[PDB]
């Protein structure tokens, strides 16, 4: 009100307003869902047109062989920080001969997020994650919040809508979690949860784009006739 | 260092800083340049409000880049010495590691240039200053006349005015100069100009500067009985 | 008053979307992507009639295989387009090759978000960067000053935008000529502009594989509006 | 008035309203204990499950400063992660120098001065955490907590967040009842009791026990989660004493 | 942040005009009267010494005339420490090219140089201007005689007479009425002494109030002279003009 | 480099400069003018290491073009040369000094007189009738300390150069190519065609 | 082994192919003319990274100057960027000798030399290289302004072959150029291989060899 | 953090006047009255040395403070802003003096320093104006004895004889009825001591009056014998007692 001029301002309850305005970003952004099993993890991303004369907004960006992510609101806020991450996977491998973590490239992206809600003059970033890999402990999904919050789930979807999705995964978590040696079954379940978020539009070719990273699978992101198969 | 966006956006899409700059230059004394066929006049109004004036130690309005190039300006004089000294500096960097004098162009869009960033850098204002920049590229007789102005567009012009009364002079060159036949000698080039500036000038006494540039460095300020003939022959051929 | 890096309460960035109003004023622009290459033709909107039109360059090349067309404060599009230009060249320098077209585009949005308390605001111009490549074809990116860009089969940025992007829905199919998509901006330039459309207040520009980037001559402009009145007289 | 607009701006009466606002963030966040036993410390935290997708004893909270010090904490989690960052860097910096690992009062003053540090302009924002840390030094055990202002003490026992009164009862309770000390194990399914009692406070959402401990005869003076028998003895102890 | 307590001293009115410029103008008008009088055998400076004292010692005061190099002295009127900062860079900038050349600094380059320092507090740093105006007397071989002024806007002008300070508008008026061209230094001083004891806000004209100085070729040959006068030299020249 | 020579007579200053650029064991051009006219009436001519005295003498020029835009007045042969001194003595504690002798030669058209600097590398400058930097000096000074007038007429300046390039074609190892001879008087700076 | 002169024709560059380190021969297939755009050239001699380097970078100068001001850049400006751009390496030990060679519109046929002391010279005839005092010898005592093109190239030809008998250093092929107001003609790779003989046979010179 | 304060906090009102630097004269009215007497053989500066607590020992606070052996400078208005600057004055009498020439700068340049200090507070970014005006006496072999005042804006002027802080107007008017140019120091201290009674509520003894002379060399104050050009310093403060005994001929 008076206390949202900058993120270097408490509210008299508490509250960084700032950073709840970078949160609404990410509720306009379009709907994209993760969810992963024992093997496998997949991203599923409604891509959004401008108009029919436009290109659908790339959604999924891969980060190293083994972890990339999905994006919701700001995409140049996207890019620097999928791009900070290409790196710390990229640091790890030159120095350490090590894969980075899933759960450690949460801690830092968190970190790296934080720095610009406590220091006047910078802003939030106004994009909301959803980390995929496989790593040495398995299959894991992370969501990122602008306010440095990360979560590892089982499933969860972010953007417009999200909320029919997240219900859909709340009540198939004990189907979809033992999808296990079989992609196409996990792709399925992540495109049937992304359809309950779905008003008007239905998914067309050029629309959906789905990832995929596992046990023997580099993170691949299937764009156009590949997703014909599951529409 | 002070980091202060000053020219930031407002709701509908304006530059304030840049508009107020603009504002500045519609403040500023008049100035006009007409090309003819083989020259381009740069002319001046000098407001008779200031007399008791050294007029031999006094900043003169036209201030010369390189031997063949000129510039004229309306706006904050304190402001135009800066892009003047920026003009003359680069004039001679680039006839230093291209072997050549800059085009008329190439100094335009420099100045140009310099007026952009004052509008897009923190800790400070737009330049207060429209310019004319007139004369003739290295071994070329094609007269060349530019406009720069604070958000640092430029264009070329067949003949342009800027400052106070700017929009009643270029009325006048708008209906008096003809693109099929510009003004074919210096003479008649210097009568339009002269004439241009009589329209909201005041007096045709100490008020009137006129600078001739012709192609090949050949560049002349007229003293005050050279323009006070062209004054006394415009109102002598207007008693009808 | 308030941070230029500020979020609305709708979580957008104020000093963005103001810029994007700034755009809106600006005089027209528009690309049409086709299979025999992209055409960009702009409103070139002389302030007087004393000011030598061709002077505007509002059609500005970054490489060969690469042109752009700019609306909104178009001295903002000067640093972008040396940035552009030596973005294309250095990478050629690097990898002896032409650089995607995409990739060009991504490095001009990459300058969009570098504003803060790096330059004082955003830009005021958007870019249509047209081009061609081996790996993706014929393209047309639409840069705005937020650092998103789309690719477009068709787009109108400028005063006249709203009212073209409707006209280019109903018109654009994936079998346009060149010599069509040059009526159809000429067409919808004419529409959309003040003054009446001639060779001298607009400019038509294409790139071609074979033949790189090519802003148009004042006659051969010229021809293709006398063939549009003839077209459109027809029936 | 305005004087709350602005960190590091004291107010009429000598407040500084940015911190006590930066305490309403803290107050705000799940139930965080401390509890200072005999040769060691025992920490545990109240993770509330928000959704059943969230991976059970995953998103771990409490974080292990160099390998001897517990630090957990109620508030904007960043903000706490932000804090133990630096105290990693303190810690590491001063053994590099002394050789020894950071004595715990020492530790102490190195988060207290940085936090202060951050009510001195108004140029950064107060941190959103209160923070409960501790462990075993040459001196012996030390439980400290830590608030927005950069305040510290040391506590026999500390609560933060949502059900700090009803903590802070039970805490109470159990430094009269037990004057020659509590034993790290005893202190376990304390926590757990203490954590299970101040759920109350949070009732909506069921909630993950998170219990850690440093003692210098059951974890050799190192910082070690409590996992599985446990754990699940804590837990269990915990559910019988609720109902 | 610190952004809500920055005036931003470098900003431009809904007009054009610069704030802090236009404010700094107000400054110098409430400030003692200068005067530069151009002859063409001199220049003479004369300045007025704001409401002193009787125990003010006014033989090793100097608030008004300071001396940039052995060519050239300046009149100031504003904020005094605001012009000592200035006259140290002139001074050295004096000193600089009289190193770099081996030649006197022109007068009008010095000007343009203090003009330009001036221009840049106008434009960027988030600093107020300089309080200060100054009428530069100097001689130079290349234009002889020169009077110039630069106000905080760092705009200069050269003049035959001037005045800047308190009561300008009355003090040209009487200067555009009594100056000619063909004047001489001792015409000029009493010019000068007559502006002052009618446009002066005090009762009489004293010698306690005034600070005098003379640009001469009256050095012997060819070569030029300055004459910052005593007190008892005021006060010969107050009596010989018969002000006193 | 190797041949600068300058000659101050009555009412001019008369720079004699060698045309030879030899790299190694080859004579690459044997057409070389080792001078830059700093402003209508002052000339400098230059000899050194390759590559600085042509960074040198075009940076100087530059300068002096640029002072005299700025002021439209032209800088007298003293106060160019006390720039250029100036210049090299900052040169000489720099991290690289620029290796570079020069003579200039100006005609100061106020004081209606021709002047001769001769500055080295150091930046040590001397006003002289007659100057040359290197090895030529050896020949040439006490030629003419024995044939020198102040009042000699440009003509007379000439012959007197032609002594000093002769004396240097017969005792001198190196083959320079001859000399390039310019004349800086009241009227500018002219080339002697035919030397 | 580089040479360039101009004549009546335009501009003659001929190059040897030879990269020796030390005594060990590297190549005789290598390419020491750069073709930076239609009208302009630059010879390579002296360190081969830093010739391929910073000359295909001149390339990227010359580009940016076209787009930047919409016309062909100066053989002039093109040598002074190469000049200015190793002069701020003075003392670094950069080695180099080129010829910008090229025809614009304002300066007709020009060559410059351009070497890593900051030399710059302009001229009609150069030679470049350990090579340069054998291409001189034949060069300088053939040459006149009234050459035909045919005898031009041929001469430029013969230069470089004399050079890459005598100098050890050069060898492998001669490569030639021609240089209009049309742009450069490149005329053919060849081998010293069969050059020699063909020449010896259809000329009777190189007396001094076992026929 | 950084310092982000970098612009003026003193700027020019639409009346012209310098907010900052009026309401840094404001602070010196309210400050406790000091003044300055020129001899023609010497200068004496005094103030009131007003005890904060009767439990405070006032003569651990410094109110006249030796800048140089023959310069002493006393104020009013904000006592710490006072012993910064006497600090920072001490400092810039070697750095921008004493180090380049090999003597102590004469009183109208060391002055000329503390004004500039002064200045650079009232323009430069992030900072207030100090709070506090000086008079500083002092002595130099081609100037003579001298006495000025520096006020917050950096102006300074010289004066035969002044008042600062609480009591000036009345001072002053009573400085100028016995002021003459025939003073011999110790007449001129006989009227500082009348012209401080004026201002003074309380006590009036030499244990609440901090009074110092800058008149002739000291030798016995030098510390060391040995060479005939070194006499001393010219600045002494003068005793508790010493000006106990002057208060009987009062
Ligand atoms: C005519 O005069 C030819 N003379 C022969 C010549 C070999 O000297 C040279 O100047 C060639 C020109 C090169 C050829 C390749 C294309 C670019 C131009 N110079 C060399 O071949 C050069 C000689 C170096 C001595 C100055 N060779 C090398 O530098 C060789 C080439 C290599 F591949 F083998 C690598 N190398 C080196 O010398 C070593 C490995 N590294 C360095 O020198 C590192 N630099 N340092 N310090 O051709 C004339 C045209
Ligand atoms: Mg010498």
Same mark, same amino acid.
């Given at each position: ?231 | ?113 310099? +007026?952009?960033?004052?509008?897009? &850098?923190?800790? *400070? #204002?737009? $330049? ?9 590229? =290295? ?20 003949? +342009?005015?800027?400052?106070?009364? &700017?929009?009643? *002079? #270029?009325? $006048? ?9 510009? =003004? ?57 | ?235 | ?243 | ?244 | ?195 | ?211 | ?250």
């Amino acid at each position: 009100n008076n206390y949202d001029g900058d993120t270097v301002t408490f509210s008299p309850t508490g509250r960084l307003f700032q950073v709840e305005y970078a949160l609404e970003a990410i509720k306009q952004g379009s709907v994209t869902v993760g969810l992963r099993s024992n093997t496998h993890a997949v991203l599923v991303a409604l891509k959004r047109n401008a108009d029919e004369l436009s290109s659908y907004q790339k959604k999924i960006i891969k980060c190293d062989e083994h972890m990339g992510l999905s994006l919701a609101g700001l995409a140049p806020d996207a890019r620097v920080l999928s791009n900070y991450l290409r790196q710390q996977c990229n640091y790890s491998s030159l120095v350490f001969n090590r894969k980075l973590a899933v759960e450690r490239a949460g801690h830092l992206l968190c970190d790296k997020a934080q720095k610009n809600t406590q220091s006047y003059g910078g802003r939030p970033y106004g994009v909301g994650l959803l980390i995929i890999g496989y790593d040495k402990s398995g299959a894991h999904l992370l969501e990122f919040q602008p306010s440095g919050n990360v979560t590892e789930l089982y499933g969860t979807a972010i953007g417009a809508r999200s909320q029919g999705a997240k219900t859909y995964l709340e009540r198939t978590l004990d189907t979809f979690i033992k999808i296990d040696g079989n992609p196409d079954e996990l792709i399925k379940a992540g495109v049937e949860a992304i359809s309950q978020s779905l008003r008007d539009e239905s998914l067309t070719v050029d629309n959906l784009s789905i990832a995929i990273v596992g046990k023997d699978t580099p993170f691949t992101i299937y764009d156009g006739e590949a997703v014909a198969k599951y529409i | 260092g002070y980091d202060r966006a000053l020219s930031i956006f407002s709701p509908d899409g304006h530059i304030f800083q840049v508009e107020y700059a603009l504002e500045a230059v519609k403040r500023g004394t008049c100035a006009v340049g007409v090309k003819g066929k083989n020259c381009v006049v740069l002319g001046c109004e000098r407001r008779s409000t200031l007399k008791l004036q050294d007029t031999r130690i006094t900043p003169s309005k036209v201030s010369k880049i390189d031997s063949h190039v000129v510039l004229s300006f309306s706006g904050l004089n304190a402001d135009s010495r800066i892009l003047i000294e920026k003009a003359r500096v680069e004039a001679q960097s680039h006839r230093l590691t291209l072997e050549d004098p800059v085009t008329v162009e190439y100094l335009t869009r420099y100045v140009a240039g310099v +007026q952009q960033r004052y509008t897009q &850098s923190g800790g *400070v #204002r737009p $330049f207060g200053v429209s310019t004319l920049i007139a004369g003739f590229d =290295p071994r070329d007789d094609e007269p060349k006349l530019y406009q720069t102005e604070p958000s640092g567009i430029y264009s070329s012009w067949s003949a +342009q005015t800027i400052g106070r009364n &700017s929009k009643t *002079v #270029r009325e $006048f060159l708008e209906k008096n100069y003809d693109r099929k036949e510009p =003004p074919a000698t210096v003479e008649e080039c210097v009568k339009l100009t002269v004439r241009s500036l009589l329209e909201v000038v005041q007096t045709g006494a100490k008020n009137i500067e006129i600078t001739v540039v012709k192609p090949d460095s050949d560049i002349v300020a007229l003293s005050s009985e050279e323009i006070n003939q062209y004054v006394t022959q415009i109102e002598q051929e207007k008693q009808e | 008053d308030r941070g230029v890096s500020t979020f609305s309460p709708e979580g957008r960035l104020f000093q963005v979307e103001y810029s994007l109003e700034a755009i809106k004023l600006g005089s027209t622009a528009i690309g049409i992507a086709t299979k025999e290459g992209v055409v960009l033709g702009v409103e070139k909107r002389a302030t007087s009639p004393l000011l030598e039109s061709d002077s505007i360059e509002k059609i500005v090349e970054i490489d060969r295989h690469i042109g752009c067309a700019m609306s909104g404060l178009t001295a903002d599009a000067r640093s972008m387009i040396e940035h552009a230009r030596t973005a294309a060249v250095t990478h050629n320098l690097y990898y002896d090759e032409d650089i995607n077209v995409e990739s060009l585009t991504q490095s001009v949005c990459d300058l969009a978000l570098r504003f803060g308390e790096l330059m004082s605001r955003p830009f005021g111009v958007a870019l249509l960067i047209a081009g061609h490549d081996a790996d993706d074809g014929y393209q047309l990116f639409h840069a705005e000053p937020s650092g998103t860009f789309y690719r477009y089969n068709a787009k109108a940025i400028g005063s006249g935008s709203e009212g073209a992007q409707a006209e280019l829905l109903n018109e654009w199919h994936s079998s346009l000529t060149l010599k069509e998509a040059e009526l159809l901006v000429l067409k919808i330039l004419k529409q959309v502009m003040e003054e009446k459309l001639d060779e001298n207040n607009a400019q038509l520009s294409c790139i071609t594989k074979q033949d790189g980037f090519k802003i148009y001559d004042n006659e051969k402009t010229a021809e293709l509006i006398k063939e549009l009145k003839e077209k459109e007289a027809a029936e | 008035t305005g004087y709350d607009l602005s960190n590091s701006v004291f107010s009429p009466d000598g407040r500084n309203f940015q911190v006590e606002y930066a305490v309403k963030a803290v107050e705000n966040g799940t139930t965080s204990i401390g509890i200072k036993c005999n040769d060691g410390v025992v920490f545990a935290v109240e993770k509330l499950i928000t959704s059943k997708l969230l991976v059970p004893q995953k998103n771990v909270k409490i974080q292990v400063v160099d390998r001897h010090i517990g630090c957990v904490y109620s508030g904007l989690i960043p903000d706490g992660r932000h804090l133990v960052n630096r105290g990693r860097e303190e810690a590491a910096s001063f053994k590099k120098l002394y050789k020894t690992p950071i004595p715990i009062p020492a530790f102490a003053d190195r988060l207290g001065q940085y936090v202060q540090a951050h009510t001195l302009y108004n140029s950064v924002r107060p941190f959103g955490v209160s923070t409960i840390f501790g462990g075993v030094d040459k001196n012996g055990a030390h439980l400290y907590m830590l608030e927005p202002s950069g305040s510290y003490w040391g506590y026999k026992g500390a609560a933060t967040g949502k059900g700090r009164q009803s903590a802070k009862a039970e805490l109470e309770k159990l430094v009269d009842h037990h004057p020659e000390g509590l034993s790290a194990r005893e202190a376990v399914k304390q926590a757990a009791k203490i954590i299970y009692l101040a759920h109350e406070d949070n009732k909506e959402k069921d909630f993950e026990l998170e219990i850690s401990w440093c003692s210098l005869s059951e974890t050799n003076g190192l910082h070690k989660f409590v996992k599985g028998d446990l754990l699940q003895e804590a837990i269990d102890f915990a559910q019988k004493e609720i109902n | 942040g610190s952004r809500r307590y920055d005036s931003r001293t470098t900003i431009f009115s809904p007009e054009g005009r610069l704030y802090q410029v236009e404010y700094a103008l107000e400054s110098i008008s409430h400030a003692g009267t200068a005067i530069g009088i151009m002859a063409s055998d001199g220049i003479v400076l004369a300045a007025e010494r704001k409401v002193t004292s009787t125990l003010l010692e006014q033989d090793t005061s100097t608030e008004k005339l300071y001396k940039l190099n052995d060519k050239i002295a300046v009149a100031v009127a504003g904020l005094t420490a605001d012009a000592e900062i200035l006259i140290n860079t002139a001074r050295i900038h004096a000193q600089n090219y009289l190193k770099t050349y081996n030649e006197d600094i022109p007068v009008e380059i010095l000007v343009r140089r203090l003009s330009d320092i001036k221009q840049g507090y106008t434009q960027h740093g988030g600093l107020r201007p300089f309080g200060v105006s100054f009428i530069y007397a100097g001689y130079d071989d290349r234009y002889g005689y020169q009077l110039y002024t630069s106000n905080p806007s760092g705009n200069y002008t050269g003049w035959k007479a001037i005045s800047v300070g308190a009561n300008t508008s009355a003090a040209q008026t009487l200067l555009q009425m009594d100056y000619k061209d063909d004047m001489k230094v001792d015409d000029a001083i009493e010019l000068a002494l007559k502006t002052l004891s009618k446009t002066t806000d005090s009762s009489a004209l004293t010698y306690d109030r005034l600070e005098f100085a003379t640009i001469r070729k009256g050095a012997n040959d060819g070569e030029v002279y300055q004459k910052i006068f005593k007190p008892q030299e005021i006060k010969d020249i107050l009596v010989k003009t018969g002000i006193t | 480099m190797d041949i600068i020579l300058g000659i101050r007579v009555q009412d001019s200053v008369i720079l004699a400069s060698s045309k030879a650029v030899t790299r190694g064991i080859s004579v690459l051009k044997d057409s070389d003018d080792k001078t830059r006219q700093l402003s209508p009436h002052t000339l400098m001519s230059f000899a050194g290491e390759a590559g600085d005295t042509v960074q040198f003498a075009e940076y100087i020029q530059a300068n002096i073009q640029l002072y005299s835009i700025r002021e439209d007045y032209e800088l007298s042969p003293q106060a160019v040369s006390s720039f250029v001194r100036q210049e090299l003595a900052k040169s000489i504690r720099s991290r690289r000094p620029y290796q570079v002798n020069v003579l200039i030669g100006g005609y100061d058209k106020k004081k209606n007189k021709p002047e001769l600097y001769q500055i080295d590398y150091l930046g040590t400058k001397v006003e002289l009738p007659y100057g040359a930097h290197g090895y030529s000096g050896f020949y040439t000074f006490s030629l003419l300390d024995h044939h020198y007038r102040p009042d000699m007429t440009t003509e007379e300046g000439l012959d007197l150069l032609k002594l000093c390039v002769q004396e240097l074609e017969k005792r001198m190892p190196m083959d320079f190519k001859g000399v390039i001879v310019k004349i800086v008087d009241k009227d500018g700076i002219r080339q002697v065609d035919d030397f | 082994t580089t040479l360039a002169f101009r004549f009546q024709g335009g501009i003659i560059v001929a190059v040897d192919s030879r990269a020796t380190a030390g005594n060990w021969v590297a190549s005789q297939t290598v390419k020491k003319v750069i073709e930076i755009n239609p009208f302009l050239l630059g010879t390579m001699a002296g360190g081969a990274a830093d010739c391929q380097f910073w000359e295909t970078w001149l390339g990227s100068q010359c580009r940016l100057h076209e787009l930047r001001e919409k016309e062909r850049i100066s053989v002039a400006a093109a040598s002074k960027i190469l000049s200015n751009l190793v002069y701020q390496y003075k003392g670094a030990g950069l080695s180099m000798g080129t010829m910008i060679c090229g025809y614009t519109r304002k300066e007709g046929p020009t060559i410059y030399y351009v070497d890593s002391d900051g030399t710059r010279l302009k001229g009609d005839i150069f030679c470049v290289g350990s090579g340069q005092t054998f291409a001189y010898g034949v060069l300088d005592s053939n040459y006149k302004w009234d050459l035909s093109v045919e005898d031009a190239l041929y001469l430029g030809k013969r230069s470089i072959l004399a050079a890459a008998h005598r100098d050890a250093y050069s060898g492998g092929s001669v490569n030639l150029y021609h240089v209009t107001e049309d742009g450069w003609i490149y005329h053919g790779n060849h081998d010293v291989g069969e050059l020699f003989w063909k020449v010896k046979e259809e000329e009777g010179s190189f007396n001094n060899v076992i026929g | 953090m950084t310092d982000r304060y970098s612009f003026s906090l003193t700027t020019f009102s639409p009346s012209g006047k310098l907010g900052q630097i009026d309401y840094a004269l404001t602070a010196v009215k309210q400050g406790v009255t000091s003044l300055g007497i020129k001899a023609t053989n010497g200068v004496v500066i005094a103030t009131e040395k007003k005890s904060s607590s009767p439990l405070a020992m006032s003569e651990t606070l410094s109110k006249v403070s030796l800048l140089t052996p023959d310069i002493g400078a006393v104020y009013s208005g904000m006592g710490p802003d006072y012993r910064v600057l006497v600090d920072k004055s001490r400092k810039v009498a070697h750095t921008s003096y004493k180090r380049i020439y090999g003597e102590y700068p004469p009183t109208k340049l060391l002055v000329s320093e503390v004004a500039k200090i002064m200045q650079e507070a009232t323009q430069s970014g992030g900072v207030r104006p100090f709070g506090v005006s000086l008079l500083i006496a002092g002595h130099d072999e081609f100037n003579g004895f001298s006495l000025y005042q520096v006020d917050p804006s950096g102006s300074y002027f010289p004066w035969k004889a002044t008042a600062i802080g609480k009591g000036s107007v009345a001072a002053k008017t009573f400085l100028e009825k016995r002021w003459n140019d025939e003073l011999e120091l110790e007449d001129a201290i006989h009227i500082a001591l009348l012209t401080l009674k004026e201002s003074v509520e309380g006590e009036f003894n030499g244990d609440t009056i901090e009074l110092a002379i800058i008149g002739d060399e000291n030798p016995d104050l030098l510390g060391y014998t040995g060479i005939p050009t070194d006499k001393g310093p010219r600045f002494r403060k003068l005793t508790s007692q010493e000006i106990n005994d002057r208060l009987e001929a009062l």
